[PDB]
């Protein structure tokens, strides 16, 4: 990636730390930030025997896809639309993570401005 050149060969204070982020509170900037939703209950994922890493916020689409495959057998070329939905949700889920990294970058780049403005005037 390109951000690596901005963290190892550049300023290490205005770059997110992948093992520590997010640093700022969830509400720092959002007045009425909403809470995330989970459509699938635990007992539904527990009964579907989803791998722990598959029990994310996209589980409901994965459950639908697996159910379709069991019923479309022996047609292994079916359920190509249910599978696509589960992949599109993961793309949406993955995008949110990208925003969090960018949100961390700008807040870190905005928290350094104070250290400039503060020490500058004072």
């Amino acid at each position: 990636g390109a951000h690596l050149a901005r963290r190892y060969l550049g300023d290490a204070s205005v770059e997110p730390d992948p093992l520590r982020m997010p640093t700022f509170p969830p509400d720092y900037g959002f007045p009425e930030r909403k809470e995330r939703e989970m459509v699938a209950t635990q007992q539904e994922m527990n009964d579907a025997q989803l791998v722990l890493q598959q029990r994310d916020y996209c589980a409901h689409y994965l459950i639908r896809f697996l159910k379709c495959k069991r019923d479309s057998f022996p047609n292994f070329l079916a359920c190509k639309h249910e599978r696509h939905d589960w992949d599109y949700c993961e793309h949406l889920d993955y995008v949110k993570r990208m925003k969090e990294f960018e949100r961390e970058r700008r807040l870190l780049q905005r928290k350094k401005r104070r250290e400039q403005r503060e020490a500058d005037m004072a």
């Binding site: 459509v39 699938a40 539904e44 025997q49 459950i63 159910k67």
Partner: protein, 127 residues
């Protein structure tokens, strides 16, 4: 360089013996002199029936041999294994542990008749 006259003479004398020895290693038409056998009647039938090599000839022969192989190497062994598993192994605790089948929303249990409640309506999306 080159063989000396004695070297050529020896190589030539040895060469004659070598060829004569190699020639004597050839089997005569009679050999090998196989002793009498106990030829079976089933073998007798297929030899004459397959001396012409017709396509419909070996097709029967191929089916005949594969049917025998299936009976003695698949059907008989599976009979023994099923008897072993069913009446000797599966009669002991925790001998064959099957991962319980996955229950998805909207299914019906064949053993109690319950219906799994469907999933909550998805909020919205496309693609």
């Amino acid at each position: 360089s080159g063989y000396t006259p004695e070297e050529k003479l020896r190589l030539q004398q040895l060469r004659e013996l070598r060829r004569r020895w190699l020639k004597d290693q050839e089997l005569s038409p009679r050999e090998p002199v196989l002793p009498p056998q106990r030829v079976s009647p089933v073998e007798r039938f297929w030899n004459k029936f397959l001396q012409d090599g017709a396509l419909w000839k070996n097709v029967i022969y191929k089916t005949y041999r594969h049917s025998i192989f299936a009976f003695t190497h698949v059907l008989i062994p599976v009979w023994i294994i099923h008897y072993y598993l069913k009446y000797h192994v599966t009669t002991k605790p925790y001998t064959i542990v099957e991962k319980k089948p996955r229950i998805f929303p909207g299914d019906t249990i064949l053993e109690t008749g319950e219906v799994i409640p469907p999933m909550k309506e998805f909020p919205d999306q496309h693609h």
